[PDB]
Amino acid sequence: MSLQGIHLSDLSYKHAILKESQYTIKRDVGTTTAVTPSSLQQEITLLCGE
Amino acid sequence: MSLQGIHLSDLSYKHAILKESQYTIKRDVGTTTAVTPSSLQQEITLLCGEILYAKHADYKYAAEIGIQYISTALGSERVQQILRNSGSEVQVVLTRTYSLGKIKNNKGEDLQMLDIHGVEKSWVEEIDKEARKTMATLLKESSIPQNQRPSAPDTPIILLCVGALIFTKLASTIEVGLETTVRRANRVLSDALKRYPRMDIPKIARSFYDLFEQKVYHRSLFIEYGKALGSSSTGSKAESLFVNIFMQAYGAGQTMLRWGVIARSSNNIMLGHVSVQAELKQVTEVYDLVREMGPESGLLHLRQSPKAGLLSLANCPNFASVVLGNASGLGIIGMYRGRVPNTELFSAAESYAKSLKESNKIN
Amino acid sequence: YPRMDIPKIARSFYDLFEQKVYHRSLFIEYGKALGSSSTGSKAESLFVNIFMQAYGAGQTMLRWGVIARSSNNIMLGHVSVQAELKQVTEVYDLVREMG
Amino acid sequence: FMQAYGAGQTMLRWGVIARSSNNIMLGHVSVQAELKQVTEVYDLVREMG
Amino acid sequence: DIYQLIM
RNA sequence: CCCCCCC
RNA sequence: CCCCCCC
RNA sequence: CCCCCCC
């Protein structure tokens, strides 16, 4: 009689599909990046000024 | 006295019969499939790029290369668990790196090629040779940024973007699937078509359609990869494109439910027609079944699960006719091949929908 | 397969289902196992469609009674019928109870 | 850095602005057919936090 | 020299 | 596909 | 049997 | 006794 059961809620379902996953993507497996230890902060600041 | 006990609830009973089973079907008991360990991700990405920027004689196993990259992204054991949980007894075979032979590369080491079970080596060396010849030709002609090389990290995601474009139309016909994939990838993958101007979208889409049709567990692997990608915190631009295409395949095979929601939203008058009013109960039951299954009810026709078909609205001819007419009146229906049971209801709904679309109101 | 013999295969299946009545239960368990899978082929979904098109087999009178209730037939209020709605409601209650 | 917060999502901000400006055409019948999914998008925003 | 390329 | 202004 | 459009 | 159509 009433169109109250005609209801989909697609976006909530899509968010649930995306967030509720038990697998994690492993990207950049072979790559490397550079970090500087905090004890070198002074000698990076100088370069940041140069 | 009152006809309140005259009530059947067939669809809930059918869903209960299907879900509440203590036996599991063991299919694909004797078959095997290929996976690539994550530690080979780099050397699969390169190959995912070599299928792209070159004109190749045969694109038979491009889809298998995209699935190999998916395997590296998820991992070998995760892929095996995904295949097992989809209902298949297929046994994964590990990709192995192997020295080509007397061929020596720039770094002084033996050139390590890929050994993927079910994809013969000869095809791999042919693709690699064609890509090397094309790249040598381009360097000879003119003197190639980092993003125009096969080593670029977004080439596997472009291959999987073609795969996802074909994945969107898996509930469709192969010709319509290929046509829509090409005609969308000429716009969606415009950047990659600028970077790689000779990547063959029709053949890659055909390879992906063939793979998805044959190896039905790779649909579940594709969906798990889409879930893993969409749950990441960061990503590239192609990865977000892939997740966009993937979520544009959510309600695949179930456009009638969506157009029924649209018809409810458009306040069509013929929804109150007496033939339709006799049928709102089973329609509400179908939507209740959708709610009960939850978020996974959308991936039913993509996974090709046998449970898909409980969501069919083929037993509501008045509702289907009114919905299709309302969709046609608003211009939504396009080239939709859905049968119209009641042509009179279809025409009346189309007329009212066009009259409503032409008119404007302030609420 | 243009030369598969549908009449003889159907006759064989009817004979088997008539004789070995436990194979009907095996068939139903296989349909339940197939319909509960996450993936499948196209023929498997076809099989589950045909299987669920056999659900209310042997009980089309209950379905047509639900249809008659839905069609708001006037003769459902006839005095001869009104004397009988109690046992009809009992039959549908038994349906609900069995589940 | 905090001037980059809603980057890529200026449509949500301008929709909040349009609600705040009491535009009449928000009540247009074509729009009224669509407030449900808009409320769903803002609900998703609230849910993500 | 084909296999000697940068790639 | 999405995104696109200013501060 | 179901599915079938566009993005 | 029951069941019996179509998809």
Domain assignment present for residue B7? The answer is no
Q: Which of B265, B266, B363 sits opposite D27 (nearest CB)?
A: B363
Assess if residue B352 is contained within a domain.
yes
Per-position DSSP letters for B78-103, written without gaps between them: HHHHHHHHTTB--EEEE-EEEEEEEE
Report CA(D10)–C1'(F4) in Å, whole number: 9
- Residue whose CA lies closest to nucleotide F5 C1': D10
Contact B46 E4 (CB under 8 A): no
Burial class (CB in 10 A: 0-12, 13-18, 19+), B101: exposed
Contact between the CB of B337 and strand G at under 7 Å: yes
Nucleotide nearest to B247 (CA to C1'): F1
Q: Are B33 and B67 in contact (CB under 8 A)?
A: no
Q: How far apart are CA B189 and CA B52, in angstroms?
A: 12
Round and report the angstrom distance from CA (B236) to C1' (G2): 38
- Spatial CA neighbour of D29 closest among B361, B104, B9, B306: B361
Tokens 């070599």 belong to residue:
B50
Using an 8 Å CB-CB cutoff, list chain A residues near B227.
Answer: 17-18, 20-21, 23
Integer Cα distance of B118 and D43 in angstroms: 47
Q: Is residue B144 part of a domain?
A: yes
Q: How far is B268 from chain A (nearest CA, A)?
A: 12
**Would B195 be classed as within a structural domain?**
yes
The amino acid present at B221, given as its one-letter code, is: L
Cα separations in angstroms, B154 against B52, B191, B247:
11, 11, 19
Q: From chain D, pick out residues whose CB is under 8 angstroms from the CB of B247.
A: none
C58: DSSP letter:
T
D-contacting chains (≥3 CB pairs under 8 Å)? A, B
* Residue with CA nearest C1' of nucleotide G4: B337
Q: Could you say which of A6, A21, A29 has the minimum Cβ distance to residue B261?
A: A6
Structural tokens at position C66: 């639900």
Instruction: Please indicate, yes or no, if residue B134 is contained in any of the structural domains.
Output: yes
Measured CA C54 to C1' H4 distance, in angstroms: 14
In a domain, B12, yes or no: no
| CA atom of B341 to C1′ atom of G5, Å | 18
Tell me which method was used to determine the 3D structure.
Answer: cryo-EM
C82 vs C55: CA distance, rounded Å:
30
**CA-based nearest residue to B332, from B360, B309, B315, B357:** B357
> E5 contacts in B (CB within 8 Å)?
106, 132, 135-136, 139
Q: How far is the CA of B88 from the C1' of F3 (A)?
A: 40
Spell out the residues 6+ positions from residue C73 whose beta carbon is closer than 8 angstroms to its own: none
Is the minimum distance from the CB of B132 to strand G below 7 Å? no
Would residue B192 count as lying in a domain? yes
Residue B21 inside a domain? The answer is: no
- How far apart CA C97 and CA B336 sit, in angstroms, is 43
Distance between start and end Cα atoms, chain E? 12
Q: Which of residues 1-49 of D touch A (CB under 8 A)?
A: 37, 40-41, 43-44, 47
Positions of chain H reached by protein Cβ under 7 A? 2-7
Distance from C-alpha of B328 to C-alpha of B325, rounded to nearest angstrom:
5
Which ranges of C1-99 would DSSP assign to H, the alpha helix?
6-19, 22-35, 42-52, 60-70, 79-82, 85-98
Chains in touch with B (3+ beta-carbon pairs under 8 Å) read A, C, D, E
Question: Rounded CA gap, C88 and C4, in Å?
Answer: 46
Nearest to B273 by CA among B235, B203, B236, B320: B320
CA distances from B240 to B185, B226, B234 (A): 15, 10, 9
8 Å CB contact of C38 and B309: no
> Which amino acid, one-letter code, is at B327?
A
- Give CA–CA dist B228/A6, Å, rounded: 31
* DSSP output for B173-192: -HHHHHHHHHHHHHHHTHHH
Number of independent structural domains in chain B: 1
The first and second tokens of residue B281, run together, are 């109960």
State how far the Cα of B49 lies from the Cα of B59, in Å rounded to an integer: 13
Note the resolution in Å, 1 decimal. 3.1
Bridge-partner residues for C22, per DSSP?
none
Q: What is the CA radius of gyration of chain C?
A: 19
**Amino acid identity, position B343:** T
The single-letter DSSP state of residue A8 is -
Let me know if B341 is exposed, middle or buried by CB neighbors in 10 A (0-12, 13-18, 19+).
middle
Question: Which three-class secondary structure state does DSSP give residue A49?
Answer: helix
Q: Which of B266, B360, B362 sits opposite D33 (nearest CB)?
A: B266
Among residues B50, B73, B68, which one has the least CA distance to residue B123? B50
Task: Print the domain residue range for B139.
Answer: 30-363
CB B119 within 8 A of CB B59: no
Residue nearest to nucleotide H4 (CA to C1'): C58
